[PDB]
Coordinates of N, CA and C in Angstrom, one line a residue:
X5 N -0.8 -8.6 -14.0 CA -0.1 -9.8 -14.3 C 1.0 -10.4 -13.0
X6 N 1.6 -9.4 -13.1 CA 2.3 -9.6 -11.6 C 1.5 -9.7 -10.4
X7 N 2.0 -10.6 -9.7 CA 1.1 -10.7 -8.1 C 0.1 -10.2 -8.0
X8 N -1.2 -10.6 -8.7 CA -2.3 -9.9 -8.8 C -3.4 -10.1 -7.3
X9 N -2.8 -10.9 -6.3 CA -3.4 -10.6 -5.0 C -2.8 -9.4 -4.1
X10 N -2.0 -8.9 -4.4 CA -1.6 -7.8 -4.1 C -2.2 -6.3 -4.6
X11 N -2.5 -6.6 -6.0 CA -3.2 -5.4 -6.7 C -4.2 -5.6 -6.2
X12 N -5.0 -6.7 -6.4 CA -6.1 -6.8 -5.8 C -6.5 -6.0 -4.5
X13 N -5.4 -5.9 -3.4 CA -5.9 -5.6 -1.8 C -5.7 -4.1 -2.1
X14 N -4.7 -3.5 -3.0 CA -4.4 -2.1 -3.3 C -5.9 -1.5 -3.9
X15 N -6.1 -2.5 -4.7 CA -7.4 -1.7 -5.1 C -8.4 -1.4 -4.3
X16 N -9.0 -2.5 -3.5 CA -9.7 -2.6 -2.3 C -9.2 -1.6 -1.0
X17 N -7.9 -1.4 -0.8 CA -7.6 -0.4 0.1 C -7.8 1.2 -0.4
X18 N -7.1 1.4 -1.8 CA -7.3 2.4 -2.5 C -8.4 3.0 -3.0
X19 N -9.6 2.5 -3.0 CA -10.7 2.5 -3.7 C -11.8 2.7 -2.1
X20 N -11.2 2.3 -0.9 CA -11.8 2.3 0.2 C -13.2 1.6 0.0
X21 N -12.9 0.2 -0.4 CA -14.3 -0.8 -0.3 C -13.7 -2.0 0.8
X22 N -14.8 -1.8 1.9 CA -14.9 -3.0 2.8 C -15.0 -4.6 2.6
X23 N -15.5 -4.5 1.8 CA -16.0 -5.8 1.0 C -15.0 -6.1 0.6
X24 N -14.5 -5.8 -0.7 CA -13.6 -6.4 -1.7 C -11.9 -6.7 -0.6
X25 N -12.0 -5.7 0.4 CA -11.0 -6.1 1.2 C -11.0 -7.1 2.4
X26 N -11.6 -7.3 2.9 CA -12.4 -8.3 3.7 C -11.9 -9.8 3.0
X27 N -12.9 -9.7 1.7 CA -12.9 -10.9 0.7 C -11.3 -11.5 0.6
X28 N -10.5 -10.3 0.1 CA -8.9 -10.8 -0.6 C -8.2 -10.9 1.1
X29 N -8.6 -10.4 2.2 CA -7.9 -10.7 3.4 C -8.0 -12.4 3.9
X30 N -9.1 -12.6 3.6 CA -9.6 -14.3 4.0 C -9.1 -15.0 3.2
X31 N -8.6 -15.0 1.8 CA -7.7 -15.8 0.7 C -6.3 -15.8 1.4
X32 N -5.9 -14.7 2.2 CA -4.3 -15.1 2.4 C -4.2 -15.2 3.8
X33 N -5.5 -15.8 4.6 CA -5.3 -15.8 6.0 C -4.7 -14.9 7.0
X34 N -5.5 -13.8 7.2 CA -5.3 -12.5 7.8 C -5.8 -12.7 9.0
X35 N -5.0 -12.5 9.9 CA -5.5 -12.3 11.4 C -6.2 -11.4 11.8
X36 N -7.0 -10.8 12.7 CA -7.8 -10.1 13.0 C -6.9 -8.7 13.2
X37 N -5.9 -9.0 13.8 CA -5.3 -7.7 13.8 C -4.3 -7.0 12.5
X38 N -4.2 -8.2 11.9 CA -4.0 -8.0 10.2 C -5.1 -7.1 9.5
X39 N -6.2 -7.3 10.0 CA -6.9 -6.7 9.1 C -7.5 -5.7 9.5
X40 N -7.6 -5.3 10.8 CA -7.5 -4.0 11.9 C -6.5 -2.9 10.9
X41 N -5.1 -3.9 11.2 CA -4.5 -2.7 10.4 C -4.5 -1.9 8.8
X42 N -4.8 -2.9 8.3 CA -5.0 -3.0 6.5 C -6.6 -1.8 6.6
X43 N -7.7 -1.9 7.5 CA -8.8 -1.3 7.2 C -8.1 0.4 7.5
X44 N -7.0 0.4 8.4 CA -6.5 1.6 9.2 C -6.0 2.6 7.5
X45 N -5.2 1.6 6.8 CA -4.5 1.8 5.9 C -6.4 3.0 4.3
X46 N -6.8 1.8 4.6 CA -7.9 2.5 4.0 C -8.5 3.3 4.3
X47 N -8.7 3.4 5.3 CA -9.1 4.5 6.1 C -8.9 6.1 5.7
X48 N -7.3 6.0 5.5 CA -6.3 6.9 5.4 C -6.9 7.6 3.4
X49 N -7.1 6.8 2.9 CA -7.5 6.7 1.6 C -9.0 7.4 1.4
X50 N -9.8 6.3 2.0 CA -11.4 7.2 2.0 C -11.0 8.7 2.5
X51 N -10.5 9.4 3.5 CA -10.1 10.5 4.2 C -9.7 11.7 3.5
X52 N -8.6 11.0 2.4 CA -8.2 11.9 1.5 C -8.6 12.1 0.2
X53 N -9.8 11.7 -0.1 CA -10.7 12.1 -1.5 C -10.1 11.4 -2.6
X54 N -10.9 11.5 -3.7 CA -11.1 10.7 -4.8 C -9.8 10.9 -5.8
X55 N -9.4 12.2 -5.6 CA -8.0 12.7 -6.4 C -6.7 12.0 -6.1
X56 N -6.8 12.2 -4.6 CA -5.9 11.5 -4.0 C -5.6 9.9 -4.2
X57 N -7.0 9.4 -4.0 CA -6.7 8.1 -4.6 C -6.2 7.7 -6.0
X58 N -6.7 8.4 -7.1 CA -6.0 8.4 -8.2 C -4.4 8.8 -8.5
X59 N -3.8 9.8 -7.5 CA -2.5 10.1 -7.6 C -1.8 9.2 -7.5
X60 N -2.4 7.9 -6.0 CA -1.5 7.4 -5.5 C -1.6 6.6 -6.6
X61 N -2.7 6.1 -7.2 CA -2.9 4.9 -8.3 C -1.7 5.0 -9.4
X62 N -1.6 6.6 -9.9 CA -0.2 6.7 -10.8 C 0.6 5.9 -10.1
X63 N 1.1 6.5 -9.2 CA 2.5 5.9 -8.7 C 2.3 4.6 -8.4
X64 N 1.4 4.1 -8.0 CA 1.8 2.5 -8.3 C 2.1 2.1 -9.4
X65 N 0.9 2.4 -10.2 CA 1.4 2.1 -11.4 C 2.2 2.6 -12.2
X66 N 3.4 3.6 -11.9 CA 4.6 3.9 -12.9 C 5.9 3.1 -12.3
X67 N 5.6 2.7 -10.8 CA 6.7 1.9 -10.2 C 6.5 0.5 -10.7
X68 N 4.9 0.0 -10.9 CA 4.7 -1.3 -11.2 C 5.0 -1.5 -12.3
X69 N 5.3 -0.5 -13.4 CA 5.8 -0.7 -15.2 C 6.8 -0.2 -15.1
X70 N 7.8 0.2 -14.5 CA 8.8 0.5 -14.7 C 10.4 -0.2 -15.5
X71 N 11.2 0.2 -15.5 CA 12.5 -0.7 -16.0 C 12.7 -1.7 -15.4
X72 N 13.0 -0.8 -14.1 CA 13.2 -2.4 -13.0 C 12.4 -3.0 -12.3
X73 N 11.4 -2.8 -13.1 CA 10.3 -3.8 -12.9 C 10.2 -4.6 -13.9
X93 N 6.4 -13.3 -8.9 CA 6.8 -12.4 -8.0 C 6.6 -10.7 -7.8
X94 N 6.2 -10.5 -6.6 CA 6.1 -8.7 -6.6 C 7.6 -8.3 -6.7
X95 N 7.5 -7.3 -7.7 CA 8.4 -6.1 -7.7 C 8.9 -5.7 -6.8
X96 N 10.6 -5.9 -6.6 CA 11.4 -5.5 -5.4 C 11.0 -4.1 -5.1
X97 N 11.0 -3.1 -6.2 CA 11.0 -1.8 -6.2 C 9.6 -1.4 -5.6
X98 N 8.3 -2.7 -5.7 CA 7.1 -2.3 -5.0 C 6.8 -2.5 -3.4
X99 N 7.8 -3.4 -3.6 CA 7.6 -4.0 -2.2 C 8.6 -2.9 -1.1
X100 N 9.5 -2.5 -1.6 CA 10.2 -0.9 -1.4 C 9.3 -0.1 -1.1
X101 N 8.6 0.1 -2.0 CA 7.8 1.5 -1.9 C 6.5 1.4 -0.6
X102 N 6.4 -0.3 -0.4 CA 5.3 -0.3 0.1 C 5.8 -0.3 1.9
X103 N 7.4 -0.9 1.9 CA 8.1 -0.8 3.0 C 8.3 0.3 3.6
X104 N 8.7 1.5 2.5 CA 8.8 2.9 3.0 C 7.7 3.7 3.6
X105 N 6.6 3.2 2.9 CA 5.4 3.8 3.1 C 5.1 3.5 4.4
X106 N 5.3 2.6 5.1 CA 4.8 1.9 6.0 C 5.8 2.2 7.6
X107 N 6.8 2.1 7.2 CA 8.2 2.0 8.0 C 9.1 3.4 7.7
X108 N 9.4 3.9 6.8 CA 10.6 5.1 6.6 C 9.5 6.1 7.2
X109 N 10.3 7.4 7.0 CA 10.0 8.4 7.5 C 9.5 9.3 6.6
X110 N 8.6 9.9 6.4 CA 7.6 10.8 5.5 C 8.9 11.2 4.4
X111 N 10.1 11.6 4.6 CA 11.4 12.3 3.4 C 11.8 11.3 2.9
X112 N 12.0 9.9 3.6 CA 12.4 8.7 2.7 C 11.0 8.1 1.8
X113 N 10.3 8.1 2.1 CA 8.9 7.7 1.3 C 8.8 8.9 0.0
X114 N 8.6 9.7 0.6 CA 8.3 10.5 -0.8 C 10.0 10.6 -1.5
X115 N 10.7 10.8 -1.2 CA 12.5 11.1 -1.8 C 12.2 10.0 -2.9
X116 N 11.8 8.7 -2.5 CA 11.6 7.2 -3.1 C 10.4 7.7 -4.4
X117 N 9.1 8.1 -3.8 CA 8.5 8.6 -4.8 C 8.5 9.5 -6.0
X118 N 9.6 10.0 -5.7 CA 10.4 11.4 -6.9 C 11.1 11.0 -7.3
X119 N 12.0 9.2 -7.4 CA 12.2 8.6 -8.1 C 11.9 8.3 -9.5
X120 N 10.7 8.4 -9.4 CA 9.7 7.2 -10.2 C 8.7 8.6 -10.9
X121 N 8.3 9.6 -10.5 CA 7.7 10.2 -10.7 C 7.3 11.9 -9.6
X122 N 8.3 12.3 -10.2 CA 8.5 13.8 -9.0 C 7.7 15.2 -9.6
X123 N 6.2 14.8 -10.3 CA 5.4 16.2 -10.3 C 4.8 16.2 -9.2
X124 N 5.5 17.6 -8.8 CA 4.8 18.3 -7.4 C 3.2 18.1 -6.6
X125 N 2.5 17.8 -7.3 CA 1.2 17.6 -6.7 C 0.8 15.8 -6.3
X126 N 2.2 14.9 -6.7 CA 2.1 13.6 -6.6 C 2.8 13.3 -5.6
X127 N 3.7 14.5 -5.1 CA 4.8 14.3 -4.1 C 3.7 15.1 -2.6
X128 N 3.1 16.0 -3.1 CA 2.5 16.6 -2.2 C 1.3 15.7 -1.6
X129 N 0.9 14.9 -2.5 CA -0.5 13.6 -2.3 C 0.3 13.1 -1.3
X130 N 1.2 11.9 -1.8 CA 2.5 11.1 -1.4 C 2.5 11.5 0.3
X131 N 3.3 12.6 0.4 CA 3.0 13.0 1.7 C 2.2 13.2 2.6
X132 N 1.1 13.5 2.1 CA -0.7 13.7 3.1 C -0.6 12.3 3.6
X133 N -0.6 11.3 2.5 CA -1.1 9.9 2.7 C 0.2 9.1 3.8
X134 N 0.9 9.6 3.4 CA 2.4 9.3 4.6 C 2.1 9.8 5.9
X135 N 1.8 11.0 6.1 CA 1.5 11.4 7.5 C -0.1 10.7 8.2
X136 N -0.9 10.4 7.1 CA -2.0 10.2 7.7 C -2.1 8.9 8.4
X137 N -0.7 7.8 7.6 CA -0.9 6.3 8.1 C 0.1 6.1 9.4
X138 N 1.0 7.4 9.3 CA 1.6 7.4 10.0 C 1.1 8.1 11.2
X139 N 0.4 8.7 11.7 CA -0.7 9.2 12.4 C -1.4 8.4 12.6
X140 N -2.4 8.1 12.1 CA -3.5 6.9 12.3 C -3.2 5.3 13.2
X141 N -1.7 4.7 12.4 CA -1.2 3.7 13.0 C -0.6 3.6 13.7
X142 N -0.8 2.8 15.0 CA 0.5 2.3 16.2 C 1.2 1.6 15.7
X143 N 2.3 1.6 16.5 CA 3.3 0.6 16.1 C 2.7 -1.3 15.6
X144 N 1.4 -1.5 16.6 CA 1.1 -2.8 16.3 C 0.3 -2.5 15.0
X145 N -0.3 -1.8 15.0 CA -1.0 -1.5 13.4 C 0.1 -2.0 12.3
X146 N 1.3 -1.1 12.4 CA 2.3 -1.0 11.5 C 3.2 -2.3 11.2
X147 N 3.2 -3.2 12.4 CA 3.7 -4.6 12.3 C 2.7 -5.6 11.4
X148 N 1.7 -5.6 12.1 CA 0.7 -6.1 11.5 C 0.2 -5.9 9.9
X149 N 0.3 -4.7 9.3 CA 0.0 -4.5 8.3 C 1.3 -5.3 7.4
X150 N 2.3 -5.1 7.8 CA 3.9 -5.7 7.2 C 3.8 -7.6 7.5
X151 N 3.2 -8.1 8.3 CA 3.4 -9.2 8.3 C 1.9 -9.9 7.4
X152 N 0.9 -9.0 7.2 CA 0.1 -9.3 6.0 C 0.6 -9.0 5.0
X153 N 1.4 -8.3 4.4 CA 1.7 -7.9 3.2 C 3.2 -9.4 3.2
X154 N 3.4 -9.9 4.1 CA 4.3 -11.1 3.3 C 3.4 -12.1 3.5
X155 N 2.1 -12.4 3.9 CA 1.2 -13.6 3.1 C 1.1 -13.1 2.1
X156 N 0.5 -11.8 1.7 CA 0.2 -11.4 0.4 C 1.6 -11.9 -0.2
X157 N 2.5 -11.8 -0.3 CA 4.1 -11.6 -1.8 C 3.8 -13.3 -1.3
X158 N 4.0 -14.4 -1.0 CA 3.7 -15.6 -0.4 C 3.2 -16.5 -1.0
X159 N 1.8 -15.8 -1.3 CA 0.6 -16.6 -1.6 C 0.8 -17.1 -3.0
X160 N 0.0 -18.1 -3.4 CA 0.2 -18.9 -4.5 C -0.8 -17.4 -5.4
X161 N -1.8 -17.1 -4.9 CA -2.8 -16.0 -5.8 C -1.7 -14.8 -5.9
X162 N -0.9 -14.9 -5.8 CA 0.8 -13.6 -6.0 C 1.5 -14.8 -6.9
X163 N 2.2 -15.7 -6.7 CA 3.2 -16.6 -7.3 C 3.0 -16.8 -8.3
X164 N 1.5 -17.8 -8.4 CA 1.3 -18.8 -9.6 C -0.1 -17.8 -10.2

């Protein structure tokens, strides 16, 4: 119910479905470098397997349904840290919501993957794309 298009894109990214990702990105006017960036994030989910994708879904669901939850500011912060924070900063933030050790280990693996896979240009473009998500009428209306 909150910001549906964000969760549509998350679902696409985390499940590794290229079609669903491309269909949603079209709706928010994604550029080619934005598509490229998001597909790299998606590749990290694909490479780390099904249980990893489940655990990351768990994190998204507990942050999203937390007490301190337009996109919930805590969700945006989680995504901002995932993309631009240090691994320690991102993982520390996850531990505030779900400090189960395999969840934190998994979070660190995905974080290390996106940091390794994405260039500075990819990271910039992921952030501009996420702004198109948060300001979409598919998010706010």
